[PDB]
Amino acid sequence: MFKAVLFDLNGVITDTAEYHFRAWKALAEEIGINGVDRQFNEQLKGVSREDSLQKILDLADKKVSAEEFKELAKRKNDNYVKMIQDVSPADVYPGILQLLKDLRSNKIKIALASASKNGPFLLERMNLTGYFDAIADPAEVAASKAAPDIFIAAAHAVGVAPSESIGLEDSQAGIQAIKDSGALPIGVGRPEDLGDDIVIVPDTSHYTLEFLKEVWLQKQK
Amino acid sequence: MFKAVLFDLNGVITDTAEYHFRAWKALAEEIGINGVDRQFNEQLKGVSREDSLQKILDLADKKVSAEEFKELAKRKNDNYVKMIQDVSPADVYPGILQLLKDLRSNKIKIALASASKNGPFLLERMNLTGYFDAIADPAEVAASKAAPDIFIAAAHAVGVAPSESIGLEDSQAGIQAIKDSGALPIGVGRPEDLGDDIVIVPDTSHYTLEFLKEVWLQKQK
Ligand SMILES: O=P(O)(O)OC[C@H]1O[C@@H](OP(=O)(O)O)[C@H](O)[C@@H](O)[C@@H]1O
Ligand SMILES: O=P(O)(O)OC[C@H]1O[C@@H](OP(=O)(O)O)[C@H](O)[C@@H](O)[C@@H]1O
Ligand SMILES: [Mg+2]
Ligand SMILES: [Mg+2]
Ligand SMILES: [Mg+2]
Ligand SMILES: [Mg+2]
Ligand SMILES: [Mg+2]
Ligand SMILES: [Mg+2]
Numbered sequence: 444m445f446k447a448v449l450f451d452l453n454g455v456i457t458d459t460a461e462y463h464f465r466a467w468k469a470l471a472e473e474i475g476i477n478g479v480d481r482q483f484n485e486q487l488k489g490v491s492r493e494d495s496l497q498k499i500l501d502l503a504d505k506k507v508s509a510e511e512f513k514e515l516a517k518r519k520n521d522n523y524v525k526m527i528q529d530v531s532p533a534d535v536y537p538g539i540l541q542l543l544k545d546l547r548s549n550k551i552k553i554a555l556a557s558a559s560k561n562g563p564f565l566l567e568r569m570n571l572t573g574y575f576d577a578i579a580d581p582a583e584v585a586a587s588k589a590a591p592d593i594f595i596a597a598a599h600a601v602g603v604a605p606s607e608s609i610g611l612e613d614s615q616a617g618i619q620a621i622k623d624s625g626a627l628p629i630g631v632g633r634p635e636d637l638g639d640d641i642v643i644v645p646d647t648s649h650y651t652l653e654f655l656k657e658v659w660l661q662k663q664k
Numbered sequence: 665m666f667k668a669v670l671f672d673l674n675g676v677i678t679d680t681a682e683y684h685f686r687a688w689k690a691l692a693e694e695i696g697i698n699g700v701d702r703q704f705n706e707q708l709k710g711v712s713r714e715d716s717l718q719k720i721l722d723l724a725d726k727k728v729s730a731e732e733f734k735e736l737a738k739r740k741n742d743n744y745v746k747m748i749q750d751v752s753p754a755d756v757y758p759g760i761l762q763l764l765k766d767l768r769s770n771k772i773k774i775a776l777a778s779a780s781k782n783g784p785f786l787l788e789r790m791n792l793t794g795y796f797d798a799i800a801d802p803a804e805v806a807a808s809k810a811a812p813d814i815f816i817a818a819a820h821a822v823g824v825a826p827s828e829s830i831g832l833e834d835s836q837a838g839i840q841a842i843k844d845s846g847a848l849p850i851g852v853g854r855p856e857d858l859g860d861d862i863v864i865v866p867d868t869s870h871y872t873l874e875f876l877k878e879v880w881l882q883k884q885k
């Protein structure tokens with residue numbers, strides 16, 4: 444059986460996309476960039492902080508010094524962190540708490556494989572820390588948006604190979620990253636967005652242990 | 665007693681999966697899409713031609729016009745049709761010819777409920793057409809994945825309700841389709857693929873009239 448589930452954070456466990464967006468938008472407007480709208484923001488979902496800033500600078504044909512780049516990312520992060528102070532257990536997505544309980548009861552490892560360096564604080568705000576066996580640290584691994592390294596690290600952090608794991612993602616690039624890791628992806632979202640080459644569910648209420656096991660068994664030949 | 669048996673084609677009466685696979689892989693290579701391997705191909709079984717092409721495009725997040733999509737499906741089908749020109753009566757799966765004889769002699773209706781538009785040609789190549797009371801036409805009803813409509817149409821084409829029928833399938837989604845139609849499914853293959861809540865035989869040599877009768881009786885209580 445799969446020995447671990449590797450969880451995305453934003454779009455799976457909860458979603459703080461609106462606050463990421465608002466913080467990026469506010470930063471962009473401050474530095475004279477006006478194109479950071481919700482459509483553009485779709486290109487930032489799932490993407491590292493630094494690659495997100497780079498996409499925003501690129502949009503505006505803007506270039507800044509290394510020092511200024513760090514300052515800008517920090518400014519956005521400080522605003523984001525202010526905005527997520529009131530995240531609570533009520534923000535856990537539908538079905539997720541029960542899934543975590545069931546995985547734990549079945550001694551299946553639970554690892555966070557989020558791009559977000561704010562993951563630990565968010566899990567604490569949601570009272571989920573006790574379920575997580577490990578959190579892969581995005582500062583420690585390759586962080587391009589389709590890079591498999593965060594998923595590989597999450598599996599390894601709980602003593603298992605990606606080949607022995609399921610990964611849950613909302614991002615197209617994250618699904619590709621899971622494939623490249625060797626883990627089995629199960630996406631959450633619409634076919635129009637994620638495609639049909641992997642198993643997807645419409646929303647997290649469909650992520651049950653029974654469903655994960657059914658998919659796993661079918662996919663292991 | 666049941667009044668009809670609704671037969672899948674590929675994986676039940678014969679299997680042309682290898683030729684479907686080779687034709688899709690050739691098409692994918694022409695358009696520069698990687699990932700159409702034998703493992704991926706498992707998810708194309710019981711899927712319509714168009715839904716199969718969509719999955720392949722989705723491997724690469726490729727988008728095409730409606731005309732381009734039609735052209736690609738046509739090119740794959742042309743290649744597939746060439747590759748099945750040598751199908752013969754020796755390709756009929758084990759036990760199937762005797763089952764057809766026994767059903768006919770017991771005045772049980774026989775209908776094809778395949779997703780494949782190439783079904784009639786294949787039955788002719790195998791010298792089986794005369795055993796079939798009807799062929800449900802997957803160009804005229806929904807027939808991909810878990811669509812019950814192809815099974816409903818097959819039953820109706822021989823004057824019976826699905827509730828009066830057994831359906832035979834090798835695909836998990838096709839088993840679901842049979843269940844949703846109201847017919848009694850009997851799968852062939854792995855429980856790991858098809859489920860633990862229907863009768864499954866390991867291979868088609870187990871599909872005998874006596875066995876179908878025993879299952880029908882057992883499932884009526
Ligand atoms: O390090 P941080 O600035 O907190 O977040 C990094 C990224 O985390 C991602 O989380 P996920 O991969 O969806 O869980 C978000 O989707 C993305 O919008 C964000 O830029
Ligand atoms: O219309 P065509 O391109 O000839 O075939 C459509 C589909 O027929 C299905 O037949 P079945 O449902 O297993 O008998 C095959 O399993 C599937 O792989 C194929 O794509
Ligand atoms: Mg996400
Ligand atoms: Mg992610
Ligand atoms: Mg609140
Ligand atoms: Mg089949
Ligand atoms: Mg079928
Ligand atoms: Mg031959």
Ligand code: NA
Binds near residue numbers: 577
């Ligand atoms: Na923990």
